[PDB]
């Protein structure tokens, strides 16, 4: 719906969540290989809250088998690594975040990741994405 790409070992798409539909443009160049990728995550949106304490809830499933909730923090609120952690509510964010990863063995099949972005101060949903990974 929102975005799609395919790497040599995965197809990746996302849509907004059924419960929440605040706009974000997220993208990754190149398309994520589950074996290993060096590139950037491009993000362009107007945050609905402050990003000083941004963290993610990652709800992941592999072929309906679901992994426990996974909390990932990007801004702890003190000397953070990213320029967007200072970005306020209703501010325009346009950034490319570099990343890399070495790659583990993943079972072949269908992956659902619902990723909620939380403002850890207010504890309110910033946005919500419904990723699909077919491996």
């Amino acid at each position: 719906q929102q975005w799609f790409c395919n790497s040599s070992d995965a197809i990746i798409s996302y849509s907004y969540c059924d419960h929440l539909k605040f706009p974000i443009s997220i993208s990754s160049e190149p398309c994520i290989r589950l074996r290993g990728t060096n590139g950037f995550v491009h993000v362009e949106f107007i945050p609905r809250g402050n990003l000083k304490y941004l963290y993610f809830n990652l709800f992941i499933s592999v072929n309906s088998i679901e992994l426990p909730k996974r909390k990932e923090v990007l801004c702890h609120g003190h000397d953070d690594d990213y320029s967007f952690c200072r970005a306020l509510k209703g501010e325009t964010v346009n950034t490319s975040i570099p990343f890399s990863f070495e790659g583990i063995l993943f079972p072949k099949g269908h992956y659902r990741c619902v990723a909620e972005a939380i403002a850890g101060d207010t504890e309110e949903k910033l946005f919500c994405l419904n990723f699909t990974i077919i491996h």
Binding site: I46, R48, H76, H78, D79, D80, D81, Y82, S83, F84, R86, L88, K89, G90, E91, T92, T95, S96, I97, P98
Partner: protein, 596 residues
Amino acid sequence: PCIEVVPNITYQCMDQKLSKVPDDIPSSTKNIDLSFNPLKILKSYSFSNFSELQWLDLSRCEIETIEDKAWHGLHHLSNLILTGNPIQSFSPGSFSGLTSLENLVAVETKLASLESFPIGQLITLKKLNVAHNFIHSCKLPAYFSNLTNLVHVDLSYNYIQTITVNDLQFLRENPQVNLSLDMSLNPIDFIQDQAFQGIKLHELTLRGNFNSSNIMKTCLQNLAGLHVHRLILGEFKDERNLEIFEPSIMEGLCDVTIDEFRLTYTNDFSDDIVKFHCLANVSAMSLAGVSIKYLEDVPKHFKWQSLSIIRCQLKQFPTLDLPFLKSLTLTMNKGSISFKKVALPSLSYLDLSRNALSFSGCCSYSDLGTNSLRHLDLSFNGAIIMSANFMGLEELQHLDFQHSTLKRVTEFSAFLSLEKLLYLDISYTNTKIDFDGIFLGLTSLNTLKMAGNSFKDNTLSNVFANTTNLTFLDLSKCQLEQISWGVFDTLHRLQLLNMSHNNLLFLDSSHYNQLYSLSTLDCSFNRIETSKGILQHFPKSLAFFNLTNNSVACICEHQKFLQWVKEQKQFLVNVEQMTCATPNTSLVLDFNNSTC
């Protein structure tokens, strides 16, 4: 209409497509958010009825014009947020009416200058934020001398390329002003000669400012003559970064005097950029998100009183012998370092949490070389092997091991020396309590957190006999099945007792008769059928007895307990919600007639 968080006080009106202010919201409201509504234009007397507002949020509200005296009845407002509004030009007396304003947030408003910015009126203004604008100059406007209360100005994400002698002229004629400057995300390549001479600042933030090493070194030189309490330096991951990062880029700094120094993320890093001579006379040193791999040959003549290492990348625990260091934080390290014996004779605070730390031989004087340690945090770490009962560390007040793997702690009186300890956390350490003298020596203790553990034969044993000063005891999730006679008899000062999420099948009131101070008893999420004993043994100080999510037997066999529930329904929590689990709804509704 909107959303109501606090009646007559706080309301949420976000993404509601409103043209103007909903003017039927209580005339006595404190806080209101109207962000993400296409307000477009802000007319006069639009805010007039709300004389007692404090916090107004108008972020991304399509606003292009503030009508003169738009704020009329707002002589009480303290926080005004205007983020992402194409106002651009602010007319004379745009903010006429805010006499009690403390914080003005003008981020991304197309604002071109602090010269034309009509704020020389607001005397009570403390913080001003003009990040993400079209500000080209760094000049501190003359009217700032009417701004007697102003301490923080954010200039992040702008177009300032030069800091000149003329910009900081205001500060130079006013050395008495406590002022902080966030200057991050400006493309600065020129700072004028002698520009920073005879000026004082509280905190100066220069993050992601410089494009190359040559420009950075050159600029820092022209910071000569600056007194700062706090200097924050570094760059961001999501920005193009300085390729080569030698310590010599810091050279300019030792012509400025710094109390506290904070280095943040840097793309390149050299382990010996921290042991640099220009940082010697600093009282607080901080690293956060830094590629440091080793911290070792730090010179003994350094004046560092606190050292903070957060989310760095040490492959080894640091060698440190700084004789004047009072405080050490090494936390959220990337790898899995093991503790290495250290000598810090002035240390009184030590946080080594969230590191997956190994510690074998914890802990005594020889590990630290201090007599002054009051705070020891070793939580969220690897295997910590107890072999010494803190000989030499009797000053300790705070000891925290939660979620670490505590080994051998039941082997002996591992806390014997801690006569002065006030706070102990051994929650989720997987300790099987096996020894009645485990807590021997803890006579000052007020807080004992030990959730998540377990007990031999699932019986709570006489481990508390001598912990007389306990006010708080968490024994939740310890798989408890039985409580020994006498276990609490000494706990005269105890106020909260958590035994939720265990496997108790019943309570016995006699277990609690000596608990004269107990205001909270949490027994929820057990499998409690009734309470045996004299029901009058339950403390008269009891205010919150939580018995929800149990499994009460509504038989005549327990007629007295069931009555007692009716009797004490004032003090049991979620009383009506409780339900029987024998012969399947409800409970306060038990009768009293089946033989009984």
